[PDB]
Scaffold this active site. Structure first.
Site, PDB file in Angstrom:
ATOM      1  N   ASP F  41      -4.399  12.880  -5.567  1.00 14.51           N
ATOM      2  CA  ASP F  41      -3.283  12.497  -4.708  1.00 14.51           C
ATOM      3  C   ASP F  41      -3.353  11.023  -4.317  1.00 14.51           C
ATOM      4  O   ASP F  41      -4.249  10.302  -4.742  1.00 14.51           O
ATOM      5  CB  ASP F  41      -3.251  13.369  -3.455  1.00 14.51           C
ATOM      6  N   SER F  42      -2.403  10.584  -3.505  1.00 13.03           N
ATOM      7  CA  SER F  42      -2.316   9.190  -3.114  1.00 13.03           C
ATOM      8  C   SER F  42      -3.618   8.694  -2.499  1.00 13.03           C
ATOM      9  O   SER F  42      -4.033   7.544  -2.769  1.00 13.03           O
ATOM     10  CB  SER F  42      -1.185   8.986  -2.111  1.00 13.03           C
TER      11      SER F  42
END
Ligand SMILES: CCCCCCCCCCCCCCCCCC(=O)OC[C@H](COP(=O)([O-])OCC(O)COP(=O)([O-])OC[C@@H](COC(=O)CCCCCCCCCCCCCCCCC)OC(=O)CCCCCCCCCCCCCCCCC)OC(=O)CCCCCCCCCCCCCCCCC
Ligand SMILES: CCCCCCCCCCCCCCCCCC(=O)OC[C@H](COP(=O)(O)OCCN)OC(=O)CCCCCCCCCCCCCCCCC
Ligand SMILES: CCCCCCCCCCCCCCCCCC(=O)OC[C@H](COP(=O)(O)OCCN)OC(=O)CCCCCCCCCCCCCCCCC
Ligand SMILES: CCCCCCCCCCCCO[C@@H]1O[C@H](CO)[C@@H](O[C@H]2O[C@H](CO)[C@@H](O)[C@H](O)[C@H]2O)[C@H](O)[C@H]1O
Ligand SMILES: CCCCCCCCCCCCO[C@@H]1O[C@H](CO)[C@@H](O[C@H]2O[C@H](CO)[C@@H](O)[C@H](O)[C@H]2O)[C@H](O)[C@H]1O
Ligand SMILES: CCCCCCCCCCCCO[C@@H]1O[C@H](CO)[C@@H](O[C@H]2O[C@H](CO)[C@@H](O)[C@H](O)[C@H]2O)[C@H](O)[C@H]1O
Ligand SMILES: CCCCCCCCCCCCO[C@@H]1O[C@H](CO)[C@@H](O[C@H]2O[C@H](CO)[C@@H](O)[C@H](O)[C@H]2O)[C@H](O)[C@H]1O
Ligand SMILES: *C(=O)CCCCCCCCCCCCC
Lengths: 106, 114, 172, 459, 182, 86, 67, 81, 155, 122, 61
Positions: F41-42
């Site tokens: 994820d980010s």
């Protein structure tokens, strides 16, 4: 997030050019094309001593001996320290010793 | 946490500014408008900066306006004020000194350079 | 700010970790707290109320400002680092080679032959590059600083010279 | 003085009868020979000045100014021949004729024994200077700069003419040698106060005194390089020379009439130096630098001490060579980027390495680095002004701090930092430009080896 | 900041009317201070222009000669008995606290002397001891004869120069040598 | 400092990724998208950039970092800044 | 060159740097130790500090209280 | 490639301070996923660094040996002379 | 540049504000003149008093050292705000607290230097004794006068 | 030292003042004090160019050391004994000054007791 | 005094010749840094002779 396909493509294209430009900064074998142990070290320090010490000190000594010291108060010496029992070279005078010490000791 | 207190010489951080948050459709439309002006000017500059045959200076009208506006107003610390202040300091100082010299009370035993 | 909420949180995360690394110094110590900090971000990762998420971010920024290292570590070549701009005095623009005396250009006959080819390529491509921008820029001028890629084969990306030919980071 | 006046006039036929392509070669070659012969003026004696005839004399105050004046003519021809290269041939000869006529008036100004003769030649310099600025200036504002220069000078000169003619009426002579023996004290009266102001305010304007200085930045910004060189190097010195001669007959009234003008100079030098820190125009910065440097000369002349006149003499020569050099350095940039904005062309040391050495040397002399004659002159004024009143050391000390700040700031702004990306016409320095700077800086530094010849008659 | 601290100590010596002690401290400080800056340069060069101490560590064995000179330098600075800095700093402190002087000035000079040990430990502890904290690509090299010789000569000065000078200069004062043990 | 090469940069970029526990060192390839393929994820992408920053000793600004989504993009970014053309 | 860089590993060393470093570190400690043996007074004090209260009124010439 | 990278399997946290951090995070339900990237700093020739006193005492073993010999050499000569 | 593109008098009407903003390449909303009061600014925009150091270091500026773009309006005091001069970037501490702590440190130090002067340290020792009448002749004393002798005794 | 604590924080009238002492006559309590002898003459200290502060009552030991220093050049480790002799003399000179301070203190103690005894008996 | 005075000046004069050669450009930039380093090392030796004279007989001039 990431690069958009147009952002990615432009970087790819500038990348090819940039790397080709950097490759072109290399010099060819002929470039630049210019136009037309102790014994060695001892000589190298013999010349330096002669040119950078002996010649300057010859010039300084001639300058100080025959131009500076011939003028009043150009070179002024702190007079030598005289101690009891000394002998003056100029006048051959002997300086008396000091008087007998009380002679505390430890 | 003790809140940040901003001075003239110590500005407020962006991350601590309530304006930077609470996005409004008008503020974004203002931000989008400024970026358009900057991009318009960047394109104008780039089309001359990258021109192969341009040898010279890219005259910037923003810099011309700046120097012109700065050099125009040719004509406190700028009037009689400072002059009068310094007049009395030196007049007062030199009057006292003159009196002492006349009364022989100023030591100038070895003063012969003036 | 131009940044989305998602971008703002990430920049704080990277900033927070770096200042945490300045405090800890020792890598084992930094690892322990870095994982605790990542936990705090992971706790509210799925918050869906953008008024609460925005509040969580603003409070986080205030906490960072109170806890930031007064003298954080800076990479030597980053802005503020001890080597930032150290080499700018060695970067000479490439147009300076045009003013070289013939005798100076004679020492590099092969470099200056390649240089002419690039100058030719720049001269021949310019007109197409200008045209591509004109017929892709929306009426009124550009709205962003993003430039297009080349579309046809044998076309170079518009406005490439000062990017491709820029000085090296260690020019001397 | 005819061994210099006649050769100087002969520069006019030489220029006019020279082959078309040789006007700059011939005028420069023969103006340098005249400068060479000007060294014969240094037959100075301890007691008597060098009095050639009833019209002209030379002493230790006029000799260094005379040598500076004749050295400057060949330097202005080198500085001028580039931007005039496309000029019509006849108009080239007229431009050179104006410079020659300016040297002619100047060498006679500094040697005139009669004050009314001094006034006529002193006031005659206006005509060639005004013509140079308004005819060969490059901008619209050269016309206003001409009028300000003209009417600032005449505003003070016309009162001066009345005062001099009054003095000859009551004393019988204006011969300077005669006035040394027949001078009588000036007593307190409103009539003598205005006689004092008339005798001095013409010279204060040319220095210029702070308050009356606003014509100078205008003229410099609009004048051609040769007009800026003569204006800074020599024409400002006319006021100082006039004040050093006229104060002889103003005693003892100068004791209290000096006070307002010392205050203007002591405070003015701090403010003009500070202004130099925020100037955006390079030529305007150097102009405000002269006002700051010439304020020291006014203070020194007004306190009238042996050390202050030696200091003032050295300052005038040293500032003459330094200010002329700085203007030529800024012109070399201007001939490339065609702008006077200081922030426009940056990081030039990268592109013009040797011209960056000239910039460094010129800046160091401007801030008066020991043992340059710029410091020697500045130091002597500080030593004597301290005796005048100890408190002045604070203003003198502060000015040295500010003078360092803007001198190096001008060096850092234009020579250091990153170069301006879009300016790609910075061609290598020409041999003409390098020789021009070396002819300013080498004689300036050589005079440190023998500074007595620039310390005036009180040495 | 160590140099500013040392320059203050020289100015203190001027204040307590000991001009010659202040001069002797100029000469002795010249050896080990110039060596510390060269030892730091050796580290900065080897860690690819890294100057922050937080990204050093583990250099004690990786840079043996730099480490030796840096310990000698730190011991000389702190006034280890019989190194170059002892023959001036030790004398100065005895003169200061057996003098008619400002009590606050004396106390602040003693506290600063304690601080000298604290920030010398700081450089040694973080630069040399512990585990390495620099980037992975190891380029530590300190085998240039120019680096070794230049530091070697200053190392020898940092040891004996104080002794050599203190025994050859003529005496120009009455050194106060009678005082309480404390 | 000793010079870099394109293959040297790629070798070290993967080397760092192979020492990260959230990535499978077998699924890893120069063209793996950290989001689509590797599942990160980010927040993990930010830490990857920080790891590359610590590896090569220079900072990647956030404006540039967020776009580097596969190992090849990181390799390309480093080479551009270091003027590596191999 | 004469010392090839390494990756995530302790660097290569020459003998001379190790020997020279060890020699000069010992030279420091021999010099410190040798000096104690000969100049221990420079660290502990050259002469005894008298206790001023152990002096008699006779020595200091304090006369009795009555006269 | 002239250069060679050591095999990446060898970098392990066990026996190093990085392991101790893992238990502490384990008690909290967390894991440290970059621990191996840090392992090299605690292994090989970078393990077992001296202490502060150990550093200050570098050379004491042989400086003392030379001092003991030197004083004994001096002790002999004084006894004879 | 044409006269219509140079600065002018203070704008009065919304159209004189609209035209001034366009001249300076600004949004009319963002354009604000310096308050009219004869000081001489004219229609020049009043831009935030922020140092050039505060701008983004990573953005690709036209002038990277000045951190300026070509064509944007320059602050009136730009030469005061270049990266070499006045800096206004945020500080980790409050400005008022820095001033209090810095002044307090200096004020306290001066106080205790005064206390030290009033109560100096010294050793329990009598004045130093010099022979020959406090070295009367060595210290430049005039020999013709006979000084009152200074007599020192054993103890 | 403790003497400062007694003076500033205790009673000041019974502690010597370093700037003014001695505040009692040299003979008070001493029947026939012998004057200190100065071995070195003024000429010997002048010829030796001793610093004026070094021209005190130990200057003869300093002169002897300086002479031995000159004669033993380049052996800069000579003059061990001569240097110590001068140093030791300066110590006894300092101890004499320590006695002066204590004498001054004890006399002040005696004075206050005298004033107290002639106070309460008033 | 002849040896003392003469040698205390060559020390200062020796440091300037490298400056004179660069400015006069009759040198050799092949190894200028070594030339400047050599000049210091010799100037240090020439400055020891005056120092020993001061240490010996306290000579000052
Ligand atoms: C009789 C009549 C004789 C006529 C006069 C004879 C002298 C003139 C000879 C000039 C021709 C010789 C020559 O070719 O010069 C080569 C010389 C070096 O050639 P280069 O290798 O090509 O260097 C390129 C750059 O120009 C080099 O630029 P750079 O910056 O790297 O170094 C050049 C140097 C400029 O040259 C110098 O100033 C020499 C150093 C000063 C000493 O720059 C500086 O010195 C900057 C520091 C300024 C000195 C500050 C210290 C003040 C000391 C105060 C005490 C003064 C003692 C009294 O070029 C110059 O520097 C030209 C300067 C000419 C003025 C010299 C002024 C002397 C002072
Ligand atoms: C605009 C100008 C128009 C306005 C009128 C100008 C005149 C007003 C100022 C008066 C000047 C002073 C004056 O007039 O004094 C006259 C005085 C007459 O005295 P007299 O009879 O000759 O001698 C025996 C004395 N019982 O004369 C004397 O005794 C000596 C006179 C010497 C010469 C005086 C010249 C007058 C100077 C006035 C200007 C001074 C300020 C210049 C400012 C320059 C600005 C840059
Ligand atoms: C005991 C006696 C002790 C006396 C102590 C009292 C005086 C204390 C104050 C001294 C002056 C303080 C101003 C100095 C300013 C300065 O040093 O310049 C540095 C400044 C920014 O530099 P920096 O802070 O390092 O930031 C760079 C990293 N980004 O860069 C700048 O902005 C400077 C460049 C612009 C020039 C500004 C002009 C400043 C003039 C005012 C200073 C005083 C001038 C002389 C007058 C006083 C002398 C009596
Ligand atoms: C202080 C001691 C000496 C002072 C002497 C003063 C006398 C006057 C000297 C200058 C005379 C100039 O005469 C005239 O002045 C005005 C401004 O001043 C100039 O005009 C200029 O300024 C005016 C208003 O400031 C503007 O409206 C005009 O657009 C502008 O061109 C003229 O172009 C010039 O021809
Ligand atoms: C740039 C501006 C410079 C401004 C400088 C200002 C200086 C001021 C000088 C004031 C002195 C004027 O001169 C002074 O006045 C008159 C002359 O009329 C003289 O006095 C004379 O006139 C006055 C009239 O009031 C009578 O009282 C007096 O009987 C008579 O002798 C003074 O004895 C003289 O000292
Ligand atoms: C009078 C002045 C004092 C004179 C005394 C001079 C000191 C003696 C000089 C020789 C010093 C040699 O010192 C000795 O060298 C070896 C060789 O590396 C060191 O040994 C070290 O490196 C080698 C190679 O890895 C291994 O032995 C070992 O891993 C390590 O401990 C010793 O730790 C050190 O004690
Ligand atoms: C041997 C030691 C040598 C060095 C000794 C140095 C001593 C210097 C002491 C200076 C003290 C001045 O600093 C003092 O600290 C407190 C702590 O916040 C400040 O207090 C300030 O902070 C908070 C709020 O921000 C509040 O407590 C208070 O309202 C506020 O004034 C004081 O306003 C300030 O006067
Ligand atoms: C008294 O003789 C005056 C001394 C002035 C201050 C000296 C500080 C020494 C403190 C003694 C305690 C021991 C701690 C090392």
């Amino acid at each position: 997030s990431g690069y958009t396909p147009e952002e990615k493509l432009r970087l790819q294209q500038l990348r090819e050019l940039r790397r080709r430009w950097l490759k072109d900064q290399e010099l060819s074998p002929r470039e630049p094309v210019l136009p037309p142990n102790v014994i060695y070290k001892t000589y190298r320090h013999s010349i330096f001593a002669f040119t950078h010490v002996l010649i300057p000190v010859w010039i300084i000594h001639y300058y100080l001996k025959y131009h500076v010291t011939t003028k009043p108060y150009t070179i002024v010496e702190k007079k030598p320290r005289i101690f009891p029992g000394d002998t003056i070279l100029e006048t051959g005078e002997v300086i008396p010793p000091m008087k007998e010490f009380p002679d505390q000791h430890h | 946490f003790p809140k940040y207190e901003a001075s003239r010489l110590s500005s407020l951080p962006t991350t601590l500014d309530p304006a930077e948050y609470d996005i409004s459709s008008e503020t974004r439309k203002a931000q989008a408008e400024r970026l358009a002006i900057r991009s318009r000017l960047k394109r104008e500059y780039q089309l001359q900066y990258y021109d192969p045959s341009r040898r010279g200076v890219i005259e910037d009208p923003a810099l011309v306006r700046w120097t012109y506006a700065r050099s125009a107003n040719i004509y406190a610390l700028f009037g009689i004020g400072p002059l009068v202040f310094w007049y009395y300091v030196f007049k007062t100082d030199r009057d006292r000194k003159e009196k002492l010299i006349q009364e022989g009370k100023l030591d100038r035993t070895f003063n012969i350079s003036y | 700010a131009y940044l989305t909420h998602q971008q703002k949180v990430l920049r704080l995360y990277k900033r927070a970790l770096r200042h945490l690394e300045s405090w800890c110094i020792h890598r084992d110590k930094y690892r322990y707290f870095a994982c605790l900090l990542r936990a705090r971000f992971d706790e509210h990762k799925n918050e869906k109320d953008m008024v609460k998420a925005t509040q969580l971010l603003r409070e986080a920024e205030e906490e960072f400002w109170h806890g930031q290292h007064p003298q954080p570590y800076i990479f030597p070549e980053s802005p503020g680092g001890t080597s930032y701009e150290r080499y700018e005095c060695y970067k000479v623009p490439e147009w300076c080679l045009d003013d070289w005396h013939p005798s100076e250009k004679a020492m590099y006959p092969d470099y200056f032959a390649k240089r002419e080819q690039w100058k030719k390529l720049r001269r021949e491509s310019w007109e197409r590059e200008v045209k591509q921008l004109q017929e892709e820029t929306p009426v009124g001028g550009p709205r962003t600083e993003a430039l297009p890629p080349a579309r046809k084969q044998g076309d170079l990306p518009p406005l490439w010279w000062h990017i491709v030919t820029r000085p090296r980071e260690r020019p001397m | 003085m005819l061994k210099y006046i006649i050769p100087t006039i002969m520069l006019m036929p030489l220029t006019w009868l020279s082959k078309n392509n040789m006007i700059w070669v011939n005028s420069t070659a023969h103006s340098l020979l005249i400068s060479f012969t000007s060294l014969l003026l240094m037959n100075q004696f301890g007691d008597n000045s060098l009095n050639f005839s009833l019209l002209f004399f030379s002493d230790s105050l006029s000799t260094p100014l005379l040598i500076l004046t004749m050295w400057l003519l060949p330097l202005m021809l080198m500085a001028s021949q580039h931007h005039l290269s496309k000029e019509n041939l006849t108009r080239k000869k007229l431009f050179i004729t104006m410079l020659i006529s300016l040297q002619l008036f100047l060498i006679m100004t500094f040697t005139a024994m009669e004050l009314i003769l001094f006034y006529i030649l002193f006031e005659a310099t206006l005509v060639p200077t005004l013509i140079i600025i308004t005819r060969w200036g490059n901008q619209t504002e050269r016309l206003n700069a001409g009028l300000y220069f003209l009417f600032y000078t005449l505003a003070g000169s016309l009162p001066l003419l009345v005062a001099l003619i009054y003095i000859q009426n009551t004393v019988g002579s204006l011969n300077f040698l005669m006035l040394q023996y027949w001078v009588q004290p000036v007593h307190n009266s409103w009539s003598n106060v205005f006689m004092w102001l008339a005798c001095m305010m013409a010279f204060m304007v040319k220095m210029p005194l702070y308050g009356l200085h606003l014509w100078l930045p205008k003229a410099h910004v609009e004048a051609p390089i040769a007009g800026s060189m003569v204006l800074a190097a020599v024409l400002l010195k006319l006021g100082g020379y006039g004040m050093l001669r006229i104060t002889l007959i103003l005693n003892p009234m100068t004791d209290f009439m000096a006070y307002p003008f010392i205050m203007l100079s002591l405070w003015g030098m701090i403010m003009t130096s500070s202004i130099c820190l925020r100037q955006t125009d390079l030529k305007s910065l150097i102009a405000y630098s002269s006002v700051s440097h010439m304020a020291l000369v006014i203070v020194a002349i007004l306190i009238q001490t042996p050390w202050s006149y030696m200091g003032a003499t050295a300052l005038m020569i040293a500032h003459g060579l330094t200010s002329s050099m700085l203007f030529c350095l800024a012109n070399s940039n201007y001939e490339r980027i065609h702008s006077r904005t200081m922030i426009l062309a940056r990081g030039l040391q990268t592109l013009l390495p040797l011209m960056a050495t000239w910039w460094l040397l010129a800046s160091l002399t401007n801030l008066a680095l020991p043992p340059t004659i710029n410091l020697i002159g500045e130091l002597f004024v500080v030593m004597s002004t301290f005796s005048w009143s100890n408190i002045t050391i604070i203003l003198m000390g502060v000015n040295m701090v500010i003078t360092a700040l803007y001198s190096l700031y001008m060096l850092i702004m234009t020579q250091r930092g990153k170069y301006t990306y879009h300016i790609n016409n910075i061609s290598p320095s020409f041999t003409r430009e390098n020789a021009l700077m070396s002819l300013h800086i080498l004689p300036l530094l050589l005079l440190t080896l023998n500074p007595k010849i620039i310390l005036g008659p009180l040495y | 900041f160590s140099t500013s601290s040392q320059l203050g100590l020289m100015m203190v010596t001027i204040g307590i009317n000991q001009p010659y002690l202040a001069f002797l401290h100029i000469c002795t400080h010249a050896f080990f201070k110039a060596m510390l800056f060269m030892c730091s340069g050796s580290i900065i060069h080897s860690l690819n222009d890294e100057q922050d101490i937080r990204k050093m560590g583990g250099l004690f064995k990786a840079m043996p000669f730099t480490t030796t000179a840096l310990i000698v330098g730190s011991l000389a600075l702190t006034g280890m008995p019989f190194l170059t800095g002892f023959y001036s700093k030790d004398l100065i402190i005895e003169a200061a606290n057996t003098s008619y002087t400002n009590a606050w000035a004396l106390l602040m000079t003693l506290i600063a002397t304690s601080f000298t040990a604290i920030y010398s430990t700081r450089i040694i502890f973080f630069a040399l001891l512990g585990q390495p904290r620099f980037p992975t690509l190891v380029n530590i090299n300190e085998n240039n004869p120019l680096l070794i010789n230049s530091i070697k000569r200053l190392l020898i000065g940092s040891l004996f120069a104080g002794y050599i000078i203190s025994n050859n200069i003529p005496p120009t004062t009455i050194p106060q040598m009678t005082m309480p043990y404390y | 400092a000793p010079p870099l090469t394109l293959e040297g940069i790629k070798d070290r970029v993967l080397y760092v990724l192979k020492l990260y526990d959230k990535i499978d060192p077998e699924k890893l390839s120069v063209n793996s998208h950290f989001m689509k393929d590797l599942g990160l994820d980010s927040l993990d992408q930010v830490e990857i950039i920080m790891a590359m920053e610590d590896e090569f000793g220079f900072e990647i600004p956030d404006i540039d970092a967020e776009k580097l989504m596969c190992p090849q993009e990181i390799v390309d970014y480093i080479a551009d800044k270091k003027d590596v053309y191999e | 060159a004469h010392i090839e860089p390494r990756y995530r590993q302790f660097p290569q060393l020459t003998r001379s740097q190790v020997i020279q470093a060890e020699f000069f570190s010992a030279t420091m400690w021999f010099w410190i130790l040798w000096r104690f043996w000969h100049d221990s007074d420079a660290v502990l004090g050259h002469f005894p500090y008298p206790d001023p209260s152990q002096w008699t009124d006779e020595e200091l010439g304090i006369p009795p209280d009555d006269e | 490639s002239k250069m060679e990278l050591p095999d990446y399997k060898q970098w392990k946290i066990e026996g190093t301070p990085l392991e101790t951090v893992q238990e502490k995070l384990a008690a909290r339900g967390l894991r440290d996923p970059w621990g191996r990237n840090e392992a090299w700093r605690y292994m090989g020739g970078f393990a077992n660094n001296v202490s502060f006193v150990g550093a200050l005492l570098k050379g004491f073993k042989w400086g003392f040996a030379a001092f003991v010999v030197a004083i004994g050499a001096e002790y002999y000569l004084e006894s004879q002379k | 540049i044409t006269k219509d593109m140079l600065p002018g008098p203070y704008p009065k009407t919304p159209e004189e504000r609209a035209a001034a903003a366009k001249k300076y390449n600004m949004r009319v909303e963002d354009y604000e003149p310096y308050p009219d009061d004869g000081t001489g600014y004219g229609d020049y925009p009043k831009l935030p008093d922020r140092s050039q150091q505060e701008r983004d270091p990573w953005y690709d500026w036209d002038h990277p050292d000045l951190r300026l773009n070509w064509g944007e309006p320059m602050h009136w005091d730009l030469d005061m705000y270049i990266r070499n001069r006045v800096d206004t970037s945020p500080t980790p501490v409050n400005w008022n607290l820095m001033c209090k702590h810095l002044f307090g440190f200096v004020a306290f130090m001066l106080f205790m230097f005064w206390v030290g002067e009033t109560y100096p340290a010294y050793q329990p020792v009598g004045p130093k004794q010099y022979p020959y009448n406090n070295l009367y002749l060595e210290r430049g004393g005039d020999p013709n006068k006979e000084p009152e002798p200074v007599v020192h005794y054993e103890i | 030292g403790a003497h400062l604590a007694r003076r500033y924080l205790g009673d000041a009238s019974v502690e010597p003042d370093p700037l003014r002492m001695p505040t009692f006559p040299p003979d008070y309590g001493f029947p026939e004090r012998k004057e200190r002898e100065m071995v070195a003459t003024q000429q010997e200290m002048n010829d030796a160019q001793l610093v004026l502060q070094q021209r005190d009552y130990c200057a003869h030991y300093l002169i002897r050391f300086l002479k031995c220093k000159r004669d033993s050049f380049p052996n800069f480790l000579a003059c061990k004994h001569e240097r110590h002799d001068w140093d030791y003399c300066e110590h006894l000179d300092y101890v004499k000054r320590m006695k002066e301070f204590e004498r001054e203190r004890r006399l002040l103690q005696r004075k206050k007791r005298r004033e107290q005894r002639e106070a309460d008996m008033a | 005094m002849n040896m003392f005075s003469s040698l205390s000046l060559v020390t200062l004069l020796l440091l300037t010749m490298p400056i004179m050669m660069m400015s006069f450009n009759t040198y050799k930039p092949s190894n200028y840094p070594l030339y400047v380093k050599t000049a210091i090392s010799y100037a240090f030796i020439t400055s020891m002779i005056p120092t020993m004279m001061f240490i010996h007989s306290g000579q000052e001039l």
